[PDB]
Design a binder for these strands. Sequence first.
RNA 1: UGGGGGGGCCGGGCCACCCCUCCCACGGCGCGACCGCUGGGGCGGACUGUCCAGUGCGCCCCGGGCGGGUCGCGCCGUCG
Length: 48
Amino acid sequence: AIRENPVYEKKPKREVKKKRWNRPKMSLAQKKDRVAQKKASFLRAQER
RNA sequence: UGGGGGGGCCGGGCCACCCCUCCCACGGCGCGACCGCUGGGGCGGACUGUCCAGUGCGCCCCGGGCGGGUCGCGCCGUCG
């Protein structure tokens, strides 16, 4: 069978629904607000 | 006092006067359109924080602000 028909048949391209499965890279503003929030929470916990 | 010294002879254009009016260049002022950046709302969602709060992202809405580049227009100035 191989020697009588070697040509390849590509699988048809599927339409894409565009779902993201990973996690996007966090931004500078987000991480700076995160560190500010952590600092404030630590100060509040020290206050109590 | 024949010699010597002068005025000249007829048309055209231009700049000077006084006014109108083009196109172009340069500067200023103002108006308008096309572009960049920035504060609010809505929708969807992703995330963060040892109180329920907060932060980006994609779409739309934006009233807009700022600024310079292109084009159009009006006005002012040039022994242009």
